Symmetry: C6
Subunit: 104 residues, 6 copies
């Protein structure tokens, strides 16, 4: 199981900015997003632990540069258990398959 | 990939005002809107980077002029990655196709 | 494209009061309402710009008279672009067609 | 068109208490409820204007007596326009038909 | 119509604790739960008025003992009208039928 | 009926961190998660009471170590009643069946 990165911000523009910076800075795959409530949005990414780390730094940076956006919470999980991958929306799907193949 | 603009405000009237000003001021396509929670609404637009910039300025202006509405957060992403376009609701749809053709 | 009026209040009773006052005061058509989150509700109306203006004043007045209700935000857009009408829930539907014919 | 009464409170127990008091105190029909967001709940009722008035007073009273519940907002509309009845969830349905017949 | 008890707390763990205490302390049936918004959860129960009273006391107690949980609002309605039972999610379903038979 | 553990935090990254720590620290099964509103997320786990206790401690610890995340509320129920298991989303599903077999 490749690493998972998760970042949450207030407002959609901030999560859009994080999304674009993350996938450009590291060899990662964006696997989904969550409308968390209270105008907060979560972005979930997958890839090698070091690539997720690089992406996360660029994501935080993009959010800081985005007007009205703030990073509320983030985490990187190096080797997520299969039970976690199954229950939480962090698994790969066929939609993001071309981006998974390109990342690895 | 043409640029993406994203703007978020408190209240629907403000997002309606932004929508109408943006599409009239620049050669852009409104691709969707998000009900973000907490009475916040997101509008997403696509087009040439300079047209999105012109639209964004007019959108911010329309929101400022709208009673009880405030721009909470906004961003412009010049060349959004395909993985971002696929996962986030910023892609073109057939509904907005006549407006895409007119913009370009 | 006939004008669009949009009004948002805290609480459903206030939006009910606005709805009834607006359609009685001007020859307008109520096209929909939005559950905006945080107990806020949006009402969207269509009609001639002057009729929408008359309706909006009566709506604001009805909300002010309604216990526990306050107008949070409102706007009137005289000639909404087709792209806006398509993406945002402000278009006419067959349900409100008898009221459209009666208004014009 | 018979009158419409609308009451909103914080918390579900309060709306349950209002519901039961209203239908017992007046010859009214409960037509629906709304989960308004932020733990607020709306109850909508229909009937003769005087019966709705009697029910509303009993509803407010029940909410006041309910632990942790407060009436946030309420309204009575004597003769709701058909456009309002169609768009907003205040119309009769077959589910509440036996209670409509009993009320009148 | 047997009595209805309704309790609301902040957070799901608190409603889980209330659920388990209520059904163990009294001869009642849990009929459903509501995700009320703002991280608030409602639990609805049915049974004899005295059994609902006993359950409610145990539920409040369980919530008080639960870390980070507080009872926000609660009510007991002895003989809920049929119109209330039909419109609000407080009626018995086949899923909870074995627990209804065991309670009575 | 095996024990149930429930933990709630602000933000998705915190619930992801709790998920991975819990399943690795104890022989437990993650049965589901809840989008609770207000950017709060609930995680529900099942297993032997002592395993759930070990997992819960590791979960709390993971949340404390996660940037911007805080444990809002948690509970452990040793022997949940069948009525609770049926109504609330805490039961096993075929998706988590391989993890149930591995835990026991
Ligand atoms: N920012
Ligand atoms: N404004
Ligand atoms: N008011
Ligand atoms: N109360
Ligand atoms: N508590
Ligand atoms: N933390």
């Amino acid at each position: 199981q490749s690493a998972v990165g998760s970042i949450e911000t207030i407002g959609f523009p901030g999560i859009l900015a994080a999304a674009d910076a993350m996938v450009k800075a590291g060899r990662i795959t964006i696997v989904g997003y969550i409308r968390a409530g209270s105008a907060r949005f979560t972005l979930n990414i997958r890839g090698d632990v070091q690539e997720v780390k690089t992406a996360m730094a660029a994501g935080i940076d993009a959010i800081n540069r985005t007007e009205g956006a703030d990073v509320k919470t983030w985490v990187i999980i190096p080797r997520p258990h299969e039970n976690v991958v199954a229950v939480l929306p962090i698994d790969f799907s066929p939609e993001v398959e071309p981006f998974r193949e390109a990342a690895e």
